[PDB]
Design a protein around this ligand. Sequence first.
Ligand SMILES: *Cc1ccc(C(=O)NCc2nccn2C)cc1
Ligand SMILES: *Cc1ccc(C(=O)NCc2nccn2C)cc1
Ligand SMILES: [Ca+2]
Ligand SMILES: [Ca+2]
Ligand SMILES: [Cl-]
Ligand SMILES: [Cl-]
Ligand SMILES: [Cl-]
Ligand SMILES: [Cl-]
Lengths: 9, 9, 227, 227
Amino acid sequence: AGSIPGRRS
Amino acid sequence: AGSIPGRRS
Amino acid sequence: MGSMERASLIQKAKLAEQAERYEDMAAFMKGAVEKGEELSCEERNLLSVAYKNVVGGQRAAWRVLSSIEQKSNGPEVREYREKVETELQGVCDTVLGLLDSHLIKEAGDAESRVFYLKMKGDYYRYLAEVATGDDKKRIIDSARSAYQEAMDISKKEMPPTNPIRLGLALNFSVFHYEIANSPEEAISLAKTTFDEAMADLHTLSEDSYKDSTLIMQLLRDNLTLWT
Amino acid sequence: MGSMERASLIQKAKLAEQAERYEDMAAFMKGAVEKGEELSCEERNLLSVAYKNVVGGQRAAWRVLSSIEQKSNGPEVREYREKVETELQGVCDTVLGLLDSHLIKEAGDAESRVFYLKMKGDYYRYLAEVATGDDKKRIIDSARSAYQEAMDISKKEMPPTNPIRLGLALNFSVFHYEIANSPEEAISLAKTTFDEAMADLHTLSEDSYKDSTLIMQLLRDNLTLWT
Ligand SMILES: *Cc1ccc(C(=O)NCc2nccn2C)cc1
Ligand SMILES: *Cc1ccc(C(=O)NCc2nccn2C)cc1
Ligand SMILES: [Ca+2]
Ligand SMILES: [Ca+2]
Ligand SMILES: [Cl-]
Ligand SMILES: [Cl-]
Ligand SMILES: [Cl-]
Ligand SMILES: [Cl-]
């Protein structure tokens, strides 16, 4: 299950 | 130009 | 980072992201937060991106080591898993400390308050992933409480397509499925979030449409995996 | 890492590689080296893999920042490039210190001595990549001298298909092309290395054949890029 990737601005 | 990758044992 | 200008810390955080130096980026943004001023929308994103990458590397390593540890059951694998786990908990505690001192209490707008409360839920969720003993239930409830307050504000103050509202619902649904052992609540939240966003897409510009549909696809990906 | 057993340091270095925690891996192998015993073939590889990953991340970040700095020509980009550069130089100095105290002087076999001298050439080459001022020429000569001693031993003591001999020649050729401004020497070395290995492949087992041809392909890739 994927949370928000949120690794790139 | 590539040197030896050498990042995996 | 007390001796560096706030603007220089922000500039170097952006440079560190370009260089994929996320530990530096997090330290720069921690320094910026500790200047005591509120954060702009862009600055909040830099803070979140920096720590998500740092904790993401720690979580990935913890899962590798925990898996090796379970297959074995000397003390080395447990000892090293414990070391990584302690470092992960320190990062989560640092982020939670920044939110508590004093980002959340000074966040009055919906966009900032929901953003920070979602962060609070996320980093308690990461603590819950590695928690076992006396406090795992209390950590889980701390995550749920932060997510719930953010949900309540986002339903009152934001349109159903708002990317922060969508990402909050996505992560709260992952919390339900992976942490709280409530897969039905996870599926129901993801479904209702997706359907209400679909019905609001007609109000959006071309660029906002792309932003919202990207996150709705993540909700759909999870529903496909869960059903 | 003075209080940890040598065997535990080696075991944790292998765990850190599986978890892609290369800073930890390097610290564990530094601790193992400082136990004072010579390193096995496998242990030498762990030392090399750990620091190659650490310095590789620093080199990639330095190139990103140096490129941004040249496009700009406040002090932030220069300051941050200098910080990354100083950290990179510290890592290179640490590796060179380990080779000098006392890995190289206790390395008597060709396989160990050539391996360490190639490392010495590599980490002086990384120093040369960022060097400008009074010492860039001396760093370049230190790299060349280490590579040259390793070449001399490998020609006397190793077959032309030996993967250490091939990788040494590959990196020395990259030194010639990228550092020493000698592209003709780079091309000549890569060509002669490839041809002499080709003529020795008939002596190898299926597994040794795969090991050697993989590195010969890297020599061919460079020749394709340089001609
Ligand atoms: C927690 C969270 C939610 C949403 C995102 C994201 O990627 N949003 C896209 C977007 N579109 C316009 C503005 N933003 C932030 C990231 C993290
Ligand atoms: C400096 C260097 C040279 C060669 C390699 C490599 O990948 N060798 C493959 C191999 N085959 C049998 C044993 N080894 C080490 C890495 C680094
Ligand atoms: Ca100021
Ligand atoms: Ca001992
Ligand atoms: Cl440990
Ligand atoms: Cl405010
Ligand atoms: Cl800096
Ligand atoms: Cl010896």
